[PDB]
Amino acid sequence: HMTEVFDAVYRGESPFGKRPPWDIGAPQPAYVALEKAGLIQGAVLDAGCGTGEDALHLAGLGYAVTGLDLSPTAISVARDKADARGLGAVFEVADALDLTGWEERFDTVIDSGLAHTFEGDRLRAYATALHRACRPGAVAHILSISDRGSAEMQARLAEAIDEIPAPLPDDDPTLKRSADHLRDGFAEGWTIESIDESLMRGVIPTTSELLDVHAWLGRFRRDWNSSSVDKLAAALEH
Amino acid sequence: XAXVXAXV
Ligand SMILES: Nc1ncnc2c1ncn2[C@@H]1O[C@H](CSCC[C@H](N)C(=O)O)[C@@H](O)[C@H]1O
Ligand SMILES: *C(=O)c1cnc2ccccc2n1
Numbered sequence A: 001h002m003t004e005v006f007d008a009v010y011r012g013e014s015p016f017g018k019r020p021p022w023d024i025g026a027p028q029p030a031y032v033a034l035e036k037a038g039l040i041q042g043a044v045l046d047a048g049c050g051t052g053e054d055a056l057h058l059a060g061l062g063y064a065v066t067g068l069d070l071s072p073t074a075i076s077v078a079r080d081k082a083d084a085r086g087l088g089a090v091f092e093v094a095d096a097l098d099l100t101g102w103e104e105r106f107d108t109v110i111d112s113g114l115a116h117t118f119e120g121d122r123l124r125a126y127a128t129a130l131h132r133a134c135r136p137g138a139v140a141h142i143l144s145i146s147d148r149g150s151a152e153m154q155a156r157l158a159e160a161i162d163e164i165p166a167p168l169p170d171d172d173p174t175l176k177r178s179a180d181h182l183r184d185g186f187a188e189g190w191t192i193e194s195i196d197e198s199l200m201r202g203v204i205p206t207t208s209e210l211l212d213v214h215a216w217l218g219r220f221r222r223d224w225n226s227s228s229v230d231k232l233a234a235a236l237e238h
Numbered sequence B: 001x002a003x004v005x006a007x008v
C-alpha cells in the first residue's frame, strides 16, 4: 500500500514532480555533523535510505554502509548513483517494519525521515525491527521533523503546490510529532541516550529553494539481549 | 504533507 505511493513519488508521478522535498541531492547536514563528531561506527544501516545520498556520503569516507528502502524505484536510483560515483554501498529493498534476513547485522543506524512516517504501534514495530537487525549495543540515530518544523515545511509546500493544504492554527493527537512520541517509540530493548534540537534540510519543488526546518535528533542505545551475549556470559559464569 | 500522511 505505502510501497506504491512512494514508488510513484520517486517515478515522478506525484504533485512534487521531479523533486520530492526530502530528495535534496546531498546528505543531511545533521548526518554529516554526526559523522564528523565520531558517532558513526561499524556496519551502518541507513533505514529508509531513499535515493542514497546519506549512505553515499558515508561510503565515500570509508564506512561499510547498507541503505534499505521499501521503494524499488528509490533503490534503483541509489544503485545508479553508486555506479556513477564508484562507491560500494549496499542498496536493497526491505520493509523496515520487518527486516527479516538482516538479523544482528548493524552497529549503527541512521534515519532521516523514515521514523516520522510511523505513528503509535507502527513506530514500535519499527523500533523492534531495528532491534532485531542491530548488533547488541548498537546505536540508532533518528532525525525526525518536529511540529515546529512540519508547520514551516507545510506552509512553504502549500504555497508552492496546489494539491497540498496549508497547515492548521493552534498548538493542539496522532498527527503530533513531539519529543515524547519518539521517546515512546523506542522503549522496549532501547535506552534514550539523548534527544537534541536539530535541523532537517528540504527542497521546494517550484524554485528548488533549499530550506532547513526544526527537527529532533534522537540517539538510542540498543540493549545487549542476544544469544551470542548470553553465551559469552555463560562461558564466564561456568 | 512531508511526511507524517506519508508523504505528499
Ligand atoms: N516500511 C518501510 N520500510 C522501508 N522504507 C520505507 C518504509 N516506509 C517508507 N519507506 C521509505 O522511507 C523514505 C522516507 S523519505 C526519506 C528518504 C531518505 N532518508 C532521505 O533522507 O532522502 C522513502 O524513501 C520511503 O520509500
Ligand atoms: C499532507 O499535506 C497531507 C495532507 N492530507 C493527507 C491525507 C491523506 C494522505 C496523505 C495526506 N498528506
Ligand SMILES: *C(=O)c1cnc2ccccc2n1
Residues within 6 Å of the ligand: A150, A154, A166, A167, A168, B001, B002, B004, B005, B006
Ligand atoms: C497525513 O495524513 C496528513 C494529514 N494532514 C496533514 C496536515 C498538515 C500537515 C501534514 C498532514 N499530514
Ligand code: NA
Residues within 6 Å of the ligand: A018, A019, A205, A208
Ligand atoms: Na525541477
Ligand code: NA
Residues within 6 Å of the ligand: A157, A158, A159, A160, A161, A162, A163, A164, A165, A166
Ligand atoms: Na496549496
